[PDB]
Amino acid sequence: HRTLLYGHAILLRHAHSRMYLSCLTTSRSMTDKLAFDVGLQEDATGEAC
Amino acid sequence: ITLFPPGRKGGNARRHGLPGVGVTTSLRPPHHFSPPCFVAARLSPAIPLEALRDKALRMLGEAVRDGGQHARDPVGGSVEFQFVPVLKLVSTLLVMGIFGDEDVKQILKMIEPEVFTEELEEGLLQMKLPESVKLQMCNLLEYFCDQELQHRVESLAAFAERYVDKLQANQRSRYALLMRAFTM
Amino acid sequence: ELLRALPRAYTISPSSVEDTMSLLECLGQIRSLLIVQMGPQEENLMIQSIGNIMNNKVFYQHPNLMRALGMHETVMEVMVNVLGGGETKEIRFPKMVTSCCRFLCYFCRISRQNQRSMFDHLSYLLENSGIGLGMQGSTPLDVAAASVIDNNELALALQEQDLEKVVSYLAGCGLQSCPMLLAKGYPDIGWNPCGGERYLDFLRFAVFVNGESVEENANVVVRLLIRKPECFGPALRGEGGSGLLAAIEEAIRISEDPARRVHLGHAIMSFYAALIDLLGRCAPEMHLIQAGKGEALRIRAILRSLVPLDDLVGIISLPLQIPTLXXXXXXXXXXXXXXXXXXXXXXXXXXXXXXXX
Amino acid sequence: LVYYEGGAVCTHARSLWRLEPLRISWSGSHLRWGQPLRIRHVTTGRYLALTEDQGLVVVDACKAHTKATSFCFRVSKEKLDTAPKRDVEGMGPPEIKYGESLCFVQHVASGLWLTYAAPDPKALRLGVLKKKAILHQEGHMDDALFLTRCQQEESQAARMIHSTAGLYNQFIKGLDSFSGKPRGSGPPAGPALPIEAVILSLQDLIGYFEPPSEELQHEEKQSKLRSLRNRQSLFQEEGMLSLVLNCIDRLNVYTTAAHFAEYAGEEAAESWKEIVNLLYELLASLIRGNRANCALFSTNLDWVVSKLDRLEASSGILEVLYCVLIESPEVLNIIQENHIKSIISLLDKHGRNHKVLDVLCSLCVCNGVAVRSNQDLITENLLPGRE
C-alpha cells in the first residue's frame, strides 16, 4: 500500500464489472468542441485510464 | 605615443614622468560658449578664460604664502573659507581642460614641491588642514590618476595598432610563401 | 582598474571622426537632457536628437561602439521616466514614445548580440505594453517581438513565464470593451478585436521561427490557451455562435450596413484570421514527430477538435465580389484566405476526394 | 458593523480587541476555556453584541446588556460538561496557550456560533475580500482563530487616540453649537467650552512627536526615527489629520476675534491665539518627516497657501508650507502661478525674511530634477524693478 500524493496519476477499477474508468472520444454534443464523455473500458491498455 | 617618457642613459630608465600631459589625442567635443547678449535653447555666457586662469593660479600662490605665514587673521575669516573655494575653482578649471602643460605645471608643484622635474618650500599636503579642504585635494589627485590612466590607454592602443600591423604582414608572408607553393 | 576600463575603450579609423563628433554631441545632449524635468520643448529637442542620431551612418557600420556607449540603456531609462504612471499618464506626452520604440526596434534589427541584450528587458516591456498601446505607432510590443525575430536560440531558450502573461492579457481583452473606441461613433460592441490582434501576432512570432515551429513553446502556449475558453471568440466558446462561417457572414453583414477610421467587420475577420493562422503555425511540423511519438498525435487531435472540418471549405467558398478594373481596402480582403489555407495543410491535409471541391 | 479584512489593516489601529472578564477582582487571571468575557474596541469605545435584527454589531456601553455582550472561548464546538465556573485566587494553570490556541467564539446566551457568513458574491471579486461576520449553526472548518498578541506601546497610543478624538469631537460640537447665534449680554451657551483640557492635550501631543536629538548616536537616532515614523503613520491612519483642520477652520473664520470672539463671550479672547498657534504647531509636528503625509497634502495646497493671515499665527503656516515643499515633490507640479505671486507679496507685506527666500529656493530643483516652469515664473515675477 502506497500513500497517494498530489500530482500523482491514479487508476480506477470498477467493483462489479471489473472494468477501468476512462474517457471516450465519441460523445453527445452539447458545447460540442469541449464535450467528451466518461465511461468504462474492459482493458486498461490505454492512456485515457 | 610612448608608454614611458623617452629614456636617457639606456638601462637606467623608467622615470614615471609627470601626469597631466597634453600629448593625449582623445576624442571629446568642444565647449561652444556664447556671448552674453543679455537678451530679455541658448548657450552659456562667455567670459575671457585666460584672465581667470592667471587669477586662480596667482591667488593660489598668494593663498599658499598666506597659509605658510600663519597669520592670526585669515583672508575670509577662517582658513577653510580662504582655501575651499579657490581650490574648487581650480578643480573645475582643471576638469574642463583649459589648463595647459605650463598651467598644470607649478599647480602640481604647489601640491608637492620636493619631487618634481629635474636633471625651502611648504607644500599644501604638508601643512595642517582644518578638514573639508582635504576633499578637494583628493578630487585633484583622482583627476591626476584619471590622466595617468588615459595616457596608459593611448599608449596601449598605439602599441596594439603597430603590433597588429606587423603581425598582419607576418601572416601574409606566412600564407604567401609555403602552402600555396604546394610541394604536396 | 585598467582591466575594468578596457571594455569601454574603442578604436576607430581616421577620416570618419567628424560624424563621431556629431554622435558624441548628440549623446551629450541626451545625457544633459536626462536630468531636466519633462516638457514639450524637451521632447521636441529629444525627438530631433534621436532623428539626427539615426541618420548619422556610424550606426550603420559599428554596433559595438553603440553597445559600449550604453545608448540603449539611456533611451530605455527615458522611456521608463516618461511612461511610468497611470494610463492617462501614459497618454500624457503621447509623442516620442513611438520614437524610442522605433529606435529600439531598429537597434534590435541592426545585428546580433544587440538583440541578446534588448532581450533582457522582455518582462518589463511586456507589462508596459498593455497600458502603452494608446494611438497608432511603435509600441513596446513591437520591440518585444523584434527581440525574438528569426532567432532559434533566445526563443526556446528563455521564455519561461512570459507566455502566460500574454495569454492572460489576451483573456482580459476577451472580456469587456475598451472605452476609447466606444466614446466616438461605436455600436458599443463588446470584445474589441483591436485589442488582442497584437498579442496574437506576438504569439505567432514566438511559436514560429525560421520556417519550423518550436515544439515546446507550441505545447506551452497550446495548454495556457486552451485552459481559458474566453480567449477564443464567443462563436467558438458560446453556443450562440457557430464556428467561423456565421461569424464571417456576420462581419460581412456589419460591413454592408453603415451601422451594425476602422471597419468593425474587417477587424473581426482580422482577429479570426490571426487566430486561425496562429493555430496553423502551432500544429506539429513536417509530420516526423507524428510518425513515432504520440504527443503530436494528441496535439493534432486537440487542434482538430477546436476547428471542425468543412468550415474552412465554407469560408473559401464564400465570395469576396472583386471590384476589379478597385475599391475599399478594408472589406473582405484577399489576404486572409491564405490564413484559412494554412490550417488546412497542417492539421487536416488533402487526401483525394476533397481535392475536387 | 464588523468585517473580515486582510492587508494593511493589521498594522493600523483599527484591529484591536481587549478582553474584559466579568469578575472585577483578579481580572488579570489566566484565561480559562469557557469563561465569559467581553470584547472591547478601544479606539471606537464599543462592545460586540448580538442584538436581534443586526447580528454581530458594536454598540455603546450604556445600551449594552450582559447576555448579548458576553462571549467565551471554547476549544471544541461540541458541548462539554456544564460546570466550567470556578473561582480561583491564584493565577492557576494556563488553560489557553499563545500561538496554538485555535479557539472559537461561541456566544453563550444564544449558544450559536458566529464564524463568518462566507457570502462569496460574483459582485466585487477584483476587490479585496471583505465578509460581514454573522452567525451560522453548523459553521465552517477553516476559521483558524489562533491567538497572537502584540499590542505593546502601540496599544498605549491607541487609547490616547480614542481619548483625544472624543475631546476634539466634543470641542467641535461646541463650535457648531454657538457659531450661528449672534451673542448678547448674558450666557452665550449652556454647556460652555473645555478650553484648558484642549490646551493641555495640544501641548502633550506636540511634546509626544518631538524630533530626535542630533547629539545621540546613529543607532539610537535611527530607532527613534523609525518609532516616530510608525506612530505618525498610525496617527494619520486613524484620522487625526483631518480633525486638526476641522478644528482650525471654525476658529479661523473669526478673523480679528476682538469683538468676534465675544460671540463666544469671555474666556475665549485670551485663549484664541494660543489655541490656534498650538494647533498649527501640532499639525506641523505631525506632517514632518513622512512622505505619505506630505503627498496627501496635494489637494490642500490651496488651503495652506490662501490663508496668509495678518495676526493669528505667522511663520506657523510657513513651516507647514516649507515641509510640504521640501518633503514631497508631487506638490511642485501643481504650484501654479498665483501661489508664487502670493508668496512674493508675503515678502513685501511682512518685510524681508530669509525663510521666504528659502521657500522660493525650495520651489525649484527639488530632488535631482529641476522644474523649469517654477524657475521662469519666479524669474519673471522677480521683475527688473529693483524694489
With cell 478594408, the residue in question is C330
Among B29, B160, B161, select the one facing C21 at the smallest CB separation: B29
Q: Which three cell numbers stand for residue B162?
A: 603597430
The answer to whether D113 and D106 are in contact (CB under 8 A) is yes
Query: Which residues of chain C neighbour A47 with C-beta distances below 8 Å?
Result: 294
Q: Name the residue type at position B70.
A: H
Q: For chain C, what's the residue count?
A: 357
Residue contact A33–C239, C-beta within 8 A:
no
Distance between CA atoms of residues D71 and D108, nearest Å = 6
Residue C222 CB neighbours (<10 A): 17
C9: chain B residues, CB-CB within 8 Å: 153, 157
What is d(CA B163, CA B155) in angstroms, rounded to the nearest whole number? 12
CA distances from B60 to B65, B89, B128 (A): 9, 10, 17
Residues 6 or more apart whose CB falls under 8 angstroms from that of D373 comprise C39
**Three-class DSSP category at D49:** strand
DSSP for C201-225? HHHHHHHEETTEE-HHHHHHHHHHH
Amino acid at position B9, single letter: K
Q: How far apart are CA B174 and CA B182, in angstroms?
A: 13
Q: Is D60 exposed, middle or buried (0-12, 13-18, 19+ CB in 10 A)?
A: exposed
How far apart are alpha carbons B157 and B159 in whole angstroms?
Answer: 6
* Chosen from B24, B147, B153 to mutate, greatest number of chain C CBs within 10 A: B153
Residue B57 CA neighbour count, 13 Å, CB half: 19
Distance CA C131, CA D244 (A): 40
Q: Which residue in the block uniquely carries the three cell numbers 504647531?
A: D281
Please, which residues 235-254 of chain C have a Cβ atom closer than 8 Å to chain A?
236, 239
Grid cell 481587549 in the structure block, residue: D18
Amino acid in position B137: M
Spell out the residues 6+ positions from residue C206 whose beta carbon is closer than 8 angstroms to its own. C148, C155, C159, C163, C217, C221
User: Considering only CA atoms, which of C188, C142, C147, C194 is closest in space to residue C170?
Assistant: C194
Alpha-helix residue ranges (DSSP H) falling in chain D: 66-69, 153-178, 195-208, 218-238, 240-252, 272-287, 291-295, 301-305, 316-327, 338-350, 354-362, 372-381
Residue B15, all three cell numbers? 622615470
* Residue D100 φ/ψ, nearest 5 degrees: -140, 30
Closest CA to A47 of A14, A19, A22: A22
Do C17 and B27 lie within an 8 Å CB cutoff?
A: yes
Cell of D32: 480559562
Q: Which of A30, A31, A33 sits opposite C306 (nearest CB)?
A: A33
Q: How long a stretch of residues is chain D?
A: 387
The 3-state DSSP class for residue C38 equals coil
Chains that touch A (3 or more CB pairs under 8 A): C
Nearest to C146 by CA among C104, C178, C185, C183: C104
Q: Which residue bears the cell 510640504? A: D324
CA distance C276 to chain A (A): 16
**CB under 8 A, 24+ apart: contacts of C20-25:** C20/B27, C20/C58, C21/B27, C21/B29, C22/C52, C22/C56, C23/C53, C23/C56, C23/C58, C24/B27, C24/B28, C24/B29, C25/B29
Alpha-carbon gap, residue D280 to D314, rounded angstroms: 10
Parallel/antiparallel/unpaired status of strands D57-59 and D46-49: antiparallel
Backbone angles phi, psi at A41, to 5 degrees: -135, 150
CA R_g for chain B? 24
Give the three-state DSSP class for C340: helix
**Would you state the cell numbers that stand for residue A12, as one nine-digit string?**
480506477
Asked if B27 lies within 8 A of C21 by C-beta distance, the reply is yes
**How many other C-beta atoms can be found within 10 angstroms of the C-beta atom of residue D51?**
13
Nearest residue in A to C302, CA atom: A33
> Under a CB-based contact definition with an 8 Å cutoff, are residues C276 and C290 in contact?
no
Strands (E), C117-234: 208-209, 212-213
| DSSP 8-class letter at B180 | G
Residues C267, C269, C271, C275, Cα dihedral to 10°? -170
Q: What is the DSSP letter of B75?
A: S
Q: Which cell goes with D110?
A: 444564544
Residue D232, Ramachandran bin (φ over 0: left; ψ between -120 and 50: alpha; else beta): alpha
Beta carbons within 10 angstroms of residue D116's beta carbon: 19
Q: Which residues of B touch C28 (CB under 8 A)?
A: 29
Q: DSSP code of D103? A: B
CA–CA gap between residue D233 and residue D196 (Å, rounded): 27
Residue A43 — φ and ψ, nearest 5°?
A: -115, 130
Cα–Cα distance list, D139 to D81, D105, D115, D136, D142 (Å): 21, 11, 6, 5, 9
Any C CB within 8 A of A29 CB: no
With a CB cutoff of 8 Å and minimum separation 6, the contacts of A24 are A36, A37, A38, A39, A41, A48
What is the spatial distance between Cα A11 and Cα A14, in angstroms, rounded to a whole number?
10
Contact flag C37-D370 (C-beta cutoff 8 Å): yes
Distance, in Å, from the CA atom of D194 to the CA atom of D171, rounded to the nearest integer, reads: 7
What is the Cα–Cα distance from D251 to D264, expressed in whole angstroms? 11
Task: Tell how far CA C304 is from the center of its chain.
Answer: 26
Residue in C with minimal Cα distance to D374 = C37
In this structure, are residues C64 and C55 in contact, taking their beta carbons and an 8 Å threshold? no
Instruction: Tell me which of C31, C37, C176 to substitute to probe the interface with D (most D C-beta atoms closer than 10 Å).
Output: C37
User: Could you tell me which residues are beta bridge partners of residue D4?
Assistant: D131
Pairwise CB contact (< 8 Å): A33 & C305: yes
CB contact under 8 A, C41 and B41: yes
- Beta strand segments in chain A, E: 20-23, 38-41
In whole angstroms, what is the distance from residue C233 CA to residue C192 CA? 10
Q: Show Cβ contacts of residue D281 under 8 Å, excluding neighbours closer than 6 positions.
A: D202, D206, D316
Residue among B5, B133, B14, B140 at smallest CA distance from B67:
B133
Tell me the CA distances in angstroms from D185 to C253, D182, D188, D201, one per residue in order. Answer: 85, 10, 8, 31
The answer to whether D and C touch (≥3 CB pairs < 8 Å) is: yes
Task: Break chain D down into helix, strand, coil percent, rounded to 5.
Answer: 40, 5, 55
Please give the Cα distance from C28 to C80 (Å, whole number).
19
The upper half-sphere exposure of residue B77, i.e. CA atoms within 13 Å in the direction of its Cβ, equals 0
**Beta-bridge mates of residue D48:** D58
Q: Which three cell numbers stand for residue D368?
A: 535631482
Residue of D nearest to C39 (CA): D372
C36:D372 CB<8 A: yes
Cell readout for D324 is: 510640504
Q: Rounded distance, CA C230 to CA D9, Å?
A: 35
Return all residues near C2 (Cβ < 8 A) that are at least 6 apart: B149, B152, B153
For residues A35 and A26, what is the distance between their CA atoms, to the nearest angstrom?
9
Which residue, among C226, C300, C305, would best test binding to A if mutated, counting the most A CBs under 10 Å from its CB? C305
Please state, as a whole number, how many other Cβ atoms lie within 10 Å of the Cβ of residue B124. Answer: 21
Q: Which of C21, C62, C69 to mutate to test the interface with B (most CBs of B within 10 A)?
A: C21
Q: Are C239 and A31 an interchain contact pair (Cβ–Cβ within 8 Å)?
A: yes
Listed by the residue before each break, gaps in chain B with C–N over 2.5 Å are: 40, 119
User: In this complex, is the C-beta atom of C305 within 8 Å of any C-beta atom belonging to chain A?
Assistant: yes
Count Cβ–Cβ pairs < 8 Å, chain A vs chain C: 8
Residue at D368: amino acid letter:
G
Tell me whether residue C349 is exposed, middle or buried, using C-beta atoms within 10 angstroms of its C-beta: 0 to 12, 13 to 18, 19 or more. exposed
Q: Which cell is C1 given?
A: 582598474
Residue of C nearest to A36 (CA): C305
Contacts of C39 in chain D (CB under 8 A): 372-373
Burial level of C188, CB count in 10 A (0-12/13-18/19+)?
exposed
Q: How far is CA D320 from CA A33, D209, D286, D315, in A?
A: 67, 15, 10, 9
Check the CA dihedral D102-D108-D111-D114 and report its sign. negative
Distance CA C287, CA C297 (A): 10
How close D368 comes to chain C (CA, Å)? Answer: 7
Crossing angle of helices C264-281 and C197-207, in 10° steps, is: 20
Beta bridge partners of D20: D38
3-state secondary structure of D184: coil
Neighboring chain C residues of A31 at a CB cutoff of 8 Å: 239
User: Rounded to a whole number, what is the distance in Å from the CA of C184 to chain B's nearest CA?
Assistant: 40
CB contact under 8 A, B27 and C2: no
D357 phi and psi angles, rounded to 5 deg:
-65, -40
Resolution (A): 3.1
Distance CA D234, CA D14 (A): 9
Tell me the three cell numbers of residue D261: 470672539
Q: Which residues pair with D40 in a beta bridge?
A: D18, D47
Single out the residue of D277, D276, D326 nearest to residue D297, CA to CA: D326
Take residue C325 and report the three cell numbers written for it: 478594373
Residues of D in contact with C43 (CB under 8 A): none
C-alpha cell at C8: 569601454
Decide if D369 and C39 are in contact by the 8 Å CB cutoff: no
Question: If we measure between CA atoms, which residue out of C103, C87, C92, C89 comes closest to residue C46?
Answer: C103
Alpha-carbon distance C193 to C265, whole Å? Answer: 9
Exposure pattern of D360-378 as b/e (b: 16+ CB <10 Å)? bebbbebeeeebeebeebb
DSSP C292-319: T-HHHHHHHHHHHHHS-TTHHHHHHHS-
Q: Chains with ≥3 Cβ pairs under 8 A against D?
A: C
Q: Please, are residues D254 and D238 in contact by the beta-carbon 8 Å criterion? A: no
User: Considering only CB atoms, which chain C residues are within 8 Å of A34?
Assistant: 229
Q: Kindly write down the DSSP assignment for every residue of B124-166, as one continuous string.
A: TTTS---SSSHHHHHHHHHHHHHHHHHHHHHHHHHHHHHHHHH
- Residue whose grid cell is 531598429: C106
C-alpha cell at B86: 579657490
Number of DSSP helices (H) and strands (E) in chain B, helices first: 5, 0
Does C229 sit within 8 Å of A34, measured CB to CB?
A: yes
What does the DSSP 8-state code read for residue A32? Answer: G
Judge whether C169 and C130 are in contact, CB under 8 Å.
Answer: yes
Q: Do C236 and A34 touch (CB under 8 A)?
A: no
What is the secondary structure of D35-46 as a DSSP string?
A: --EEEEETTTTE
